[PDB]
Scaffold this active site. Structure first.
Site, PDB file in Angstrom:
ATOM      1  CD  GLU A  17       0.103   7.007   9.710  1.00  0.00           C
ATOM      2  OE1 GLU A  17      -0.943   7.431   9.173  1.00  0.00           O
ATOM      3  OE2 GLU A  17       0.716   6.000   9.298  1.00  0.00           O
ATOM      4  NE  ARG A  18      -2.243   0.880  13.239  1.00  0.00           N
ATOM      5  CZ  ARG A  18      -2.464  -0.413  13.060  1.00  0.00           C
ATOM      6  NH1 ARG A  18      -1.483  -1.298  13.139  1.00  0.00           N
ATOM      7  NH2 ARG A  18      -3.701  -0.832  12.808  1.00  0.00           N
ATOM      8  CE  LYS A  57      -2.516   1.248   3.671  1.00  0.00           C
ATOM      9  NZ  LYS A  57      -3.614   1.194   4.675  1.00  0.00           N
TER      10      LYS A  57
END
Ligand SMILES: [Mg+2]
Lengths: 338, 355, 166, 167, 84, 119, 118
Positions: free
Chosen positions: B184-185, B158
């Protein structure tokens, strides 16, 4: 004795028009702009379902009336209205400009043109919420409306004044069949026979400005942008707009229906309007109801659809053909809204 | 002029209530400024509570806040730096560059809350966006100004697919893309930033082809619900000034939906669904109506979509699917075995795949 | 230990004022000052009860509360504090006033317009409510008897109704 | 109906209307189910530890304009209406360092194993901002869990947040 | 503390569904607006704050790492629940 | 006789609140009339809200209702014409004929709210 | 009995779930916002406060047997599901196996105990 007089004189000051000028009878002051519905103080002479002006170009409708305050639903983004802002009534029920001048025009949920083609020549102003015709004015549907589809004309025929549902999952036609109907109306709309002519109107609640733009372009390409009216309730526009647009188009079609003409109305994605009214309801702290929808969603759709009927010869023999569109989940007719 | 000031009255978790003076009450969605020792926390205005008190949603953590603390009004909504200066920079929800690369010296700073282009400004005819990828613009052609749904995951490339889309749009057209990572992580985001630094997508010493305006998960609800709007406004400026075919990436649109649920269904409102906000269709329309094709340019959205419980009828995927134009499915296994770009040729559909 | 319970719900202010007074003094002085406040309020109707609207900023509420402050500081005792705290709280100020007079009435006068079947108004000014109600009723039936609208005796209709129904 | 009910819900119930000065201290209005609604504490911070007269600790989440809501760290029995409440002056913090090795501690770092006081190298707030994007490195080092299936098919790396999901 | 000092440390948060239950209890008892399964609005925010602190630092920060192992107890295998 | 005049205080969708004076409170489910421009609007008293205010349900559309409008009490619940006269006629909720065949010449108008015949 | 008398105790509580049911019962009228499945917000808290006092200490041992009633035979109900973690040996009686004629009705699969170790 003079000290009370001076006290009264200085008390009438520093307070503005809350109790000095206009006494908030025709005017008012916002108490608190709610989630989507501003608690407004004043407007003593306001009536239920009355259009209001928020001094920032935002219209409003009076759904919440209390002995102390009046709750006004916001026709647009709630950002433009502030707490304590000056608010004045328009002096009339929520009304829609109607007439033959809207032919070949696209408007919003309140009749305001959005194509930038100048002001609209309106024969009159019909109220958004108009009671449906009774038993006698209605007449059994006998005139045909030809949609152009073999599977729809030959089988499951639709007549003028009939309220025929279009059910699809995501992309299984739905608005497509409405488009073939609209384009097939061109066969008689170019003629001089008023009885056979069908002045169609279109509803675009929950749809994109881009999708409605392409729709208008396709209608113009097939010369259908001459007898068709499009009301656009974009998903960007506030939920009250998506609520009002079907009633806007209902009044538009009812103008033709009462004046002896025949009209067709496509309530495209009435499920989106249902979710818009649901959002409005639980913004009013209304009960969640049955399957997240307010208990009056059926009343909403019913009072919306009943305005479409075939009038008898005594009432000009007009008609209003309804083609509501329901977007379903997995081809399910057993859901609440379907 | 005299700055508008206010006082903090209530701090309910991420909800902060601010009281102002008469005629000084800010409109909702405005940005309120408070000076905190940890950093620069601001509050977005939510519904007015009356008595000259406004409910606000914290853009950052609320630790350390004191009742009655001075609150400064910015006079408008949250304003994010915009322009080519933001390309290659990492921007949070509040517009501050968290890449510590220095202040973004942009001559313009547009608010994140802007009214989408009017019906007249909308493109009359739908147009195809040439993405330069054979599998993409033959079976699921990308709508110019459409909201493309990327149905991939992890291990299906991705990130490399997004980078290739950025490079192709910046090569074929102006294509100053923008990546907006909702929730977002801070590990996937760091990895992605490192890869774009490795590739030509991000080039610190020279020019970059994308802006990484993303928000971390550890931010309060509303921050994830407004990073999308910040990147959206950046793309809007790029479209309305340079006349470019801008390409916008949403790391997870469902994450935006759930963030909007947490801010606008469980922090003052009433849920109307499986648990999402009553206004779900409404704020979805506000976000994705500003993504369209105008007379000057066109911003194209490639938003990765996650389906909760693999439920296609779920009202949040139902709302997102109610407008997706074309969808790209980076399938796991059936496509990545062999074919490197993946992009499942069968499940990738398009509404513009017509004559 | 207030004489009568207002049970809160907009009535807490009157009980608080009564407790503050009973702490030291001014069971009456504060009360006639409050009665003067109400009289001034009703003296100017458009200027005395329209101003008590919720749509009013704190500064203008303060200006109003100085406005009632007039006529050689008739405002005395803790009434001024009541107006001060009402400016920053619920604005309109009539029912808690009535609650104050009712509380002081129970404190020092102890009257109530009972009579069961009698639709009269025999107010009595006495704390020992044992037999003086009979004297009040006798006086009311003796002189006055203005309306005497009994609106049909309930025992007769009730007994007839149970008789016919069995 | 010219005038409607003045008050519907009221948070400030005090009637003295003088001598408040409740900046660094407060008084309990409602205590129950581990929640002690306290009037005052005008200078309290969000989730800042607070001390009650009974000695039990509490940390304040809700900061309503009239009263501040403190969740109690212990039994609500010790807290009574009108009890004096005083601020600790600091956010929730824990003793941290290498001395915690081989020790069992409670939610506040107090040693519950009975092995003696905790050797604290320092004190860090429980609610601290996570490290930003830049002060991170891609996960490369392996966390060898010792499980063949776990270490083979779903490896865990240093800095990862692998979830042990299951019934 | 270990992570910022150059030491690699593992942490097992274990049951966070019970932590989520405790936070939900606190929120409802604090009259906060409830949500899915009556859970608080920012419980996902809570879990995000809790989990984001565990990560691998760069060499400039001492190359320390903090590895998190949260545990969620699903009810009847329902991984589609809110907290899961 | 003496008309019972009420003032509208709240109009909540199809529900209208009416305030009366002392000892003029209509009972639950009584019919209340307002002279709207389009005709007459009938209100059925659903609840007593206290302070001499009654919560009522509208028999027709509530658009155009201004707070403080005069409300007339009919003295009883909604009465619909009954008997063989109503046979062949179309009647709405209020009781007026909607078949456009003239008024119904019914000798009696029984209330719509009646007790069950028990056992 | 356990502490002062220093004797082994068998605390038999039949359908301990009634405690949590009564807690959720009073919570609604106690001005408490209901939790999931219409339970009290504090269910885990007061239930654990009860359960932990049932334990074996250095002064004595309590071999407690507690029955748990699962509403609607649903093992995912918050009260029994949270009660599971407070319990050493677990014996689940499902209606399905009882329907097959096995009168003890103990479902052999989820009936698990920590003592099941080599
Ligand atoms: Mg369609």
């Amino acid at each position: 004795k003079a000290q009370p007089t001076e006290v009264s004189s200085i008390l009438e000051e520093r307070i503005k028009g809350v109790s000095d000028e206009a006494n908030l009878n025709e005017t008012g002051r916002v108490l608190a702009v709610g989630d989507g519905i501003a608690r407004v103080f004043g407007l003593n002479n306001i009536q239920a379902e009355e259009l209001v002006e928020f001094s920032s170009g935002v219209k409003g409708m009076a759904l919440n009336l209390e002995p102390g305050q009046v709750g006004i639903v916001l026709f647009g983004s709630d950002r433009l209205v502030k707490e304590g802002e000056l608010v004045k009534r328009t002096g009339n029920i929520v009304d829609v400009p109607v007439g033959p001048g809207l032919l070949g025009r696209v408007v919003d949920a309140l009749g305001n043109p959005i194509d930038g083609k100048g002001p609209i020549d309106a024969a009159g102003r019909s109220r958004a919420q108009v009671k449906a015709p009774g038993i006698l004015p209605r007449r059994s549907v006998h005139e045909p409306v030809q949609t152009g589809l073999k599977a729809v004309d030959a089988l499951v025929p639709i007549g003028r004044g009939q309220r025929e549902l279009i059910i699809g999952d995501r992309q299984t036609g739905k608005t497509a069949v409405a488009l073939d109907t609209i384009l097939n109306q061109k066969r008689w709309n170019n003629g001089s026979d008023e009885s056979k002519k069908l002045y169609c109107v279109y509803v675009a609640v929950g749809q994109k400005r881009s999708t409605v733009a392409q729709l208008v372009q396709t209608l113009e390409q097939h010369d259908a942008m001459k007898y068709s009216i499009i009301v656009a309730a974009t998903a960007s526009e506030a939920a009250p707009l998506q609520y009002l647009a079907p009633f806007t188009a209902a009044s538009i079609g009812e103008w033709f229906r009462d004046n002896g003409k025949h009209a067709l109305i496509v309530y495209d994605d009435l499920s989106k309007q249902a979710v818009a009214y649901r959002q409005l309801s639980l913004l009013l702290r209304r009960p969640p109801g049955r399957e997240a929808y307010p208990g009056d969603v059926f009343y909403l759709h019913s009072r919306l659809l009943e305005r479409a009927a075939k009038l008898s010869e005594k009432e000009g023999s007009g008609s209003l053909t309804a083609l509501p569109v329901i977007e379903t989940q997995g081809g399910d007719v057993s859901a609440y809204i379907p | 002029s005299t700055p508008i000031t206010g006082k903090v009255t209530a701090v309910i978790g991420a909800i902060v209530d601010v009281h102002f003076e008469q005629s000084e009450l800010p409109a909702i969605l405005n940005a309120l400024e408070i000076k905190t020792p940890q950093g620069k926390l601001v509050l977005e205005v939510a519904q007015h509570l009356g008595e000259n008190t406004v409910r606000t949603i914290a853009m950052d953590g609320t630790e350390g806040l004191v009742r009655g603390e001075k609150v400064l009004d910015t006079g408008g909504p949250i304003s994010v730096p915009v322009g080519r200066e933001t390309l290659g920079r990492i921007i949070n929800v509040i517009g501050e560059p968290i890449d510590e690369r220095g202040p973004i010296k942009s001559k313009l700073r547009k608010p994140i809350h802007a009214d989408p282009p009017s019906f007249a400004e909308q493109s009359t005819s739908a147009e195809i966006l040439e993405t330069g990828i054979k599998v993409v613009d033959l079976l699921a052609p990308y709508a110019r100004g459409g909201k493309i749904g990327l149905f991939g995951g992890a291990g299906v490339g991705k990130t490399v697919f997004i980078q290739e889309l950025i490079n192709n749009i910046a090569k074929a057209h102006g294509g100053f893309s923008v990546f907006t990572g909702v929730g977002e992580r801070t590990r996937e985001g760091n990895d992605l930033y490192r890869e774009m630094k490795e590739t030509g997508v991000i080039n610190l010493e020279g020019e970059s082809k994308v802006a990484l305006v993303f928000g971390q998960m550890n931010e309060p609800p509303g921050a994830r619900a407004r990073v999308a709007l910040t990147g959206l406004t950046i793309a809007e400026y790029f479209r309305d000034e340079e006349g470019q075919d801008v390409l916008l990436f949403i790391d997870n649109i469902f994450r935006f939906t759930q963030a909007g649920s947490e801010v606008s269904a469980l922090l003052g409102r009433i849920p109307s669904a499986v648990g999402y906000q009553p206004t779900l269709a409404t704020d979805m329309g506000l976000l994705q109506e500003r993504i369209t094709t105008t007379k000057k340019g066109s911003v194209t959205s490639v938003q990765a979509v996650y389906v909760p419980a693999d439920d296609l009828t779920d009202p949040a995927p139902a709302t997102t699917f109610a407008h997706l134009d074309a969808t790209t499915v980076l399938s796991r296994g059936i496509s990545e075995l062999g074919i490197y770009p993946a992009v499942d040729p069968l499940d990738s559909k398009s509404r513009l795949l017509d004559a | 230990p207030p004489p009568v319970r207002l049970f809160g719900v907009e009535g807490t202010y009157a009980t608080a004022l009564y407790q503050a007074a009973a702490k030291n003094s001014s069971i009456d002085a504060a009360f006639q000052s409050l009665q003067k406040v109400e009289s001034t309020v009703k003296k100017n109707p458009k200027l005395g009860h329209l101003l008590l609207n919720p749509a009013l900023s704190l500064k203008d509420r303060n200006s109003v509360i100085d406005a009632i402050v007039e006529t050689h500081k008739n405002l005395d005792g803790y009434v001024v504090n009541l107006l001060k705290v009402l400016s920053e709280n619920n604005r309109l100020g009539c029912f808690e006033k009535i609650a104050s007079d009712f509380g002081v009435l129970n404190d020092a006068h102890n009257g109530l317009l009972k009579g069961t079947v009698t639709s009269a108004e025999p107010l009595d000014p006495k704390s020992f409510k044992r037999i003086e109600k009979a004297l009040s009723a006798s006086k009311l039936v003796g002189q006055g008897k203005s309306l005497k609208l009994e609106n049909v005796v309930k025992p007769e209709i009730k007994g007839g109704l149970i008789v016919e129904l069995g």
